[PDB]
Design a binder for this molecule. Structure first.
Ligand SMILES: CCCCCCCCCCCCCCCCCC(=O)OC[C@H](COP(=O)([O-])OCC(O)COP(=O)([O-])OC[C@@H](COC(=O)CCCCCCCCCCCCCCCCC)OC(=O)CCCCCCCCCCCCCCCCC)OC(=O)CCCCCCCCCCCCCCCCC
Ligand SMILES: Cc1cc2nc3c(=O)[nH]c(=O)nc-3n(C[C@H](O)[C@H](O)[C@H](O)COP(=O)(O)O)c2cc1C
Ligand code: SF4
Lengths: 215, 56
């Protein structure tokens, strides 16, 4: 990666120990951070590895729009990583191990924040549509299953589906992950899993509202 | 059954029982030859998840 190559000469000049002094064990160094979405000051900043997410947002991004209580969800490491809600975002650190223990992963350290005035299902569905448009089509699980996920997700936003399917969708994602040639299939499966795991009531309520409205 | 009273009594007495109670000819008590459509439920393997064929 560009960042690894670009930091190697400074590591050589200043020493491995100087770089290793930062962060926790097995999480050494300083990492570039991108903050985007529903923040007052979206920006790119360089900061110590194991920073808290809330500290990073409140210090460098100017805070989440409408105050911290207005936070709904965060995707901490780019679209591939699953999202985490406010309850876990409160006291989570920004590194590989800590973010894995939160069932997400550090990824590329691309924080994308969403307040409570956005449609979380719509945002995840847009990410799935991006993945559908970006798959190379070489192997059948990614090609077929990501197209299928895209179609299911679009229906989910509307609420046109039924409650039983959600589990179906979860199973479909499992089938894709670990069965493809490359990790694009995993990167499409994980956001769906995160959305299901943390916002199943929202999907159920949307389906119920659609069923009530359509009789 | 359209049988007269005297004929009914004679056949009942010859048979030794009441024949009008249990007639071997069928009448309007059978079901109609046109019926409403059925719905016909599905079986237990019609789930959308937790339904892998290797487990059944
Ligand atoms: C014996 C004398 C003849 C009378 C007679 O047999 O009537 C039996 C008469 C009718 O008995 P049933 O079989 O229970 O009646 C069937 C329905 O009446 C069936 O009634 P239906 O609606 O089918 O009408 C048919 C009708 C007309 O049907 C016919 O024309 C065919 C008969 C031709 C025979 C000649 O029957 C008749 O009028 C002819 C009866 C016999 C005439 C001889 O029974 C009696 O009068 C008792 C007689 C004593 C028994 C010994
Ligand atoms: C679908 C997909 C897209 C990727 N895109 C990039 C990318 O744009 N830039 C990048 O540095 N790594 C990308 N990666 C990860 C690369 O494999 C990575 O660069 C490689 O492992 C070496 O990176 P490293 O210097 O961090 O070890 C991508 C991986 C996948 C599965
Ligand atoms: S998982 Fe990777 S190799 Fe397979 S179809 Fe998707 S992009 Fe192509």
């Amino acid at each position: 990666n560009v960042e690894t190559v670009a930091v190697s000469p400074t590591i050589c000049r200043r020493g491995g120990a100087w770089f290793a002094s930062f962060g926790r064990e097995r999480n050494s160094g300083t990492k570039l951070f991108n903050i985007s979405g529903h923040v007052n000051h979206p920006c790119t900043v360089e900061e110590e590895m194991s920073v808290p997410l809330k500290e990073l947002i409140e210090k460098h991004a100017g805070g989440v729009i409408g105050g911290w209580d207005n936070l709904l969800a965060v995707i901490p490491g780019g679209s591939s990583t699953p999202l985490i809600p406010k309850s876990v975002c409160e006291t989570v650190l920004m590194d590989f191990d800590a973010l894995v223990q939160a069932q997400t992963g550090l990824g590329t350290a691309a924080v994308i924040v969403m307040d409570r005035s956005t449609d979380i299902v719509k945002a995840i569905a847009r990410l799935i549509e991006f993945y559908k448009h970006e798959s190379c089509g070489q192997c059948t699980p990614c090609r077929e299953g990501v197209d299928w996920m895209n179609k299911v997700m679009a229906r989910f936003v509307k609420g046109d589906a039924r409650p039983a399917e959600i589990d179906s969708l979860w199973e479909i994602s499992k089938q894709i992950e670990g069965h493809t040639i490359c990790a694009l299939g995993d990167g499409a499966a994980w956001p769906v899993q995160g959305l299901i795991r943390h916002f199943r009531p929202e999907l159920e309520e949307r389906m119920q509202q659609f069923a009530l409205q359509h009789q | 059954a359209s049988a007269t009273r005297v004929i009914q009594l004679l056949r009942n007495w010859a048979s030794g029982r009441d024949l009008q109670a249990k007639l071997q000819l069928r009448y309007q008590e059978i079901s109609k030859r046109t019926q409403p459509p059925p719905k016909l439920p599905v079986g237990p393997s019609h789930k959308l998840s937790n339904n892998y064929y290797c487990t059944r």
